[PDB]
Design a protein around this ligand. Structure first.
Ligand SMILES: CC(C)(O)CCC[C@H](CC#CC(O)(C(F)(F)F)C(F)(F)F)[C@H]1CC[C@H]2/C(=C/C=C3C[C@@H](O)C[C@H](O)C3)CCC[C@]12C
Ligand SMILES: CC(C)(O)CCC[C@H](CC#CC(O)(C(F)(F)F)C(F)(F)F)[C@H]1CC[C@H]2/C(=C/C=C3C[C@@H](O)C[C@H](O)C3)CCC[C@]12C
Lengths: 239, 10, 239, 10
């Protein structure tokens, strides 16, 4: 009926990690190759590269992420990166105009903006549709942050060695998550499941991204516009 | 393999 | 005493190739990651990547460059790229303020600008000193363009297979070069040699760039700021 | 080897 000291240390830790790695001002966005509205590919690529960087920083600060092997950190990051990015982008997503809005109109990404980076306007449907549902759940910062750490710490990913110690870390986080809602979120008797459903939503979005990403990554005139980080994270090289 | 991820993980 | 029709076709061809690949307005420079005055590394990296692209385009248009094997094209481009880039940058170099000036002050590269991309202010001396000498020679567009094609077509590079057919192409170009000066450049009885000396100057600058480039390319936090093209051209992978 | 140089040379 009340969260325990350690469940609270965990929440505190994650919240800060996210403040420390999610720039509310989006001030770094002027250092990206500018948007031109595959004319958006250089900018989005930089946005995604940058975002991978934040995600990595966030992860390092998840309780017991660092005690994992380098190999598992990499395995978890590579497979979960795009999902974390999709999740975190929800903070900039806006229901009023169905667009991610990043502190200025040079940094407003609408659905046409995005077709201009090589994706089909209709394999983007699920992503928008997902941001809108996620948004509707009016997550607490605590829960948003918790969902991301739970995502990252999915042991059901290609390449993970210790899917027993990662299961442990995840379970602990779902424990925190589930209590938090119960104890601290009026009207959320049904939320945990809605969120968990979002984790499965993500898997599919992940799948879809990989298919399009494979398409671009195979045409050198496109791959050349990515960054070394993107190429490495989204690449199929194997530890 | 994974030059940069490794570096950013140290 | 007068250049032959074919020597003139060659000159015409090179001049155009250079117009077709050297944007006098430098209008593409707004698509680079902006300069911040290793804070200049993202911008210069984009400048260099872009420049490699032009150089490649130029090369393709050199008489008989395309009839070479893919392998030799690559071998010639990889080893000569930085030299061509250094040469071509002379068009934007200014004696009045010892700086490359690219159609706007966001695009004025002075020597401090450059230390901020990871190089020593004193392994840059030779490069500035070289631009200044090159500038002093007040090359005709014809000769500037000819020197670049002669550079590219140096057969004394690592990896070149047919250093007999490339020697042929180069010789032919030096023939054109040498006649052009004789027939069309008053006061240039000594120039060809001064230029040829510049080709040897370049080799050393090349050497020096490789040493610094190796330094940056080995620290992932730096290599990550380069582009796929730069990494590939300047990389040591072997055909 | 040399994915992009190749492509840009076609
Ligand atoms: C449906 C699907 C998966 O096909 C969409 C993919 C498009 C793209 C992801 C990508 C990619 C690439 O394949 C890359 F190569 F891998 F890069 C590229 F498209 F090819 F490039 C999506 C994912 C999340 C979206 C957005 C996030 C917004 C953010 C702003 C802010 O909230 C901070 C967030 O981290 C990030 C808005 C713009 C479009 C984004 C970045
Ligand atoms: C002395 C020496 C070799 O140590 C200088 C190297 C710095 C740098 C080249 C590089 C590099 C890198 O190692 C890269 F990684 F390989 F990228 C990087 F530094 F690490 F990035 C020099 C070479 C030519 C110079 C300039 C050219 C100007 C141009 C403008 C216009 O005239 C068009 C020209 O093509 C180009 C001005 C800015 C500084 C430049 C680009």
């Amino acid at each position: 009926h009340m969260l325990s000291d350690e469940q609270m240390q965990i929440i505190n830790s994650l919240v800060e990690a996210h403040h420390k790695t999610y720039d509310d001002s989006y001030s770094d966005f002027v250092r990206f190759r500018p948007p031109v509205r595959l004319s958006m590919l250089p900018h989005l690529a930089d946005l995604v590269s940058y975002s991978i960087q934040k995600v990595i920083g966030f992860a390092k600060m998840i309780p017991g992420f660092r005690d994992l092997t380098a190999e598992d950190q990499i395995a978890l990051l590579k497979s979960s990166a795009i999902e974390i990015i999709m999740l975190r982008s929800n903070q900039s997503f806006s229901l009023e105009d169905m667009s991610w809005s990043c502190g200025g109109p040079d940094f407003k990404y609408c659905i046409n903006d995005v077709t201009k980076a090589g994706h089909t306007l209709e394999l983007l449907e699920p992503l928008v549709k997902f941001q809108v549902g996620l948004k509707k759940l009016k997550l607490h910062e605590e829960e948003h942050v918790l969902l991301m750490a739970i995502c990252l710490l999915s042991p059901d990913r290609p390449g993970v060695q210790d899917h027993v110690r990662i299961e442990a870390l995840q379970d602990r986080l779902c424990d925190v998550l589930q209590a938090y809602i119960r104890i601290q979120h009026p009207g959320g008797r049904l939320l945990y499941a809605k969120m968990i459903q979002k984790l499965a939503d993500l898997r599919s979005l992940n799948e879809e991204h990989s298919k399009q990403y494979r398409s671009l990554s195979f045409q050198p005139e496109h791959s050349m516009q990515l960054t070394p980080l993107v190429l490495e994270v989204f690449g199929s090289e194997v530890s | 393999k994974h030059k940069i991820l490794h570096r950013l993980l140290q």
